[PDB]
Amino acid sequence: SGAIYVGNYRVVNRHLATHNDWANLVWEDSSRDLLVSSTTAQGCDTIARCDCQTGVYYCSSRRKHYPVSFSKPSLIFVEASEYYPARYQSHLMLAVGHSEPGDCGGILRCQHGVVGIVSTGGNGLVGFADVRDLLWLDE
Ligand SMILES: Cn1ccc(NCc2ccccc2)n1
Ligand SMILES: [Zn+2]
């Protein structure tokens, strides 16, 4: 679990979105596994605006942060999970690293701020859902 809190927005994995998130829907994209919901308390988080391919993610299954090299956001085939059938996830970045389903919501961050959130895994790669392209989160 976990989310990004920036201005009056809450960013979560779409598949982990609560009733409250959907009642306060701002934007969702199923192919990205993201949902943004409106918040009544302001958010302090800084979103990275950059094309960094290095940083650090939180791994709740290890209670520890890991430094990684990651791919640029892309269209990667992702196997069926429970929450989705097999489909092309968009804006996905991969790193060689440990993750399990409950690690979703873990933040990936670089020196510029939040890059994205853990979204999928398998075969020893962690996938993160990129948020740096959503310039509207910083208004
Ligand atoms: C973020 N994330 C989703 C799946 C995953 N790792 C693959 C996996 C699936 C089920 C049990 C154990 C490991 N990491
Ligand atoms: Zn950066």
From Swiss-Prot:
It comes from the Viruses. Coiled coil: none annotated. It catalyses: Selective cleavage of Tyr-|-Gly bond in the picornavirus polyprotein. The active site is at 15 (for protease 2a activity), 33 (for protease 2a activity), 104 (for protease 2a activity). Zn(2+) 1 binds at residues 50, 52, 110, 112. Cysteine protease that cleaves viral polyprotein and specific host proteins. It is responsible for the autocatalytic cleavage between the P1 and P2 regions, which is the first cleavage occurring in the polyprotein. Also cleaves the host translation initiation factor EIF4G1, in order to shut down the capped cellular mRNA translation. Inhibits the host nucleus-cytoplasm protein and RNA trafficking by cleaving host members of the nuclear pores. Counteracts stress granule formation probably by antagonizing its assembly or promoting its dissassembly. Homodimer. This is Protease 2A. It comes from Coxsackievirus A16 (strain G-10). The chain holds residues 869 to 1007 of 2193 of the full protein.
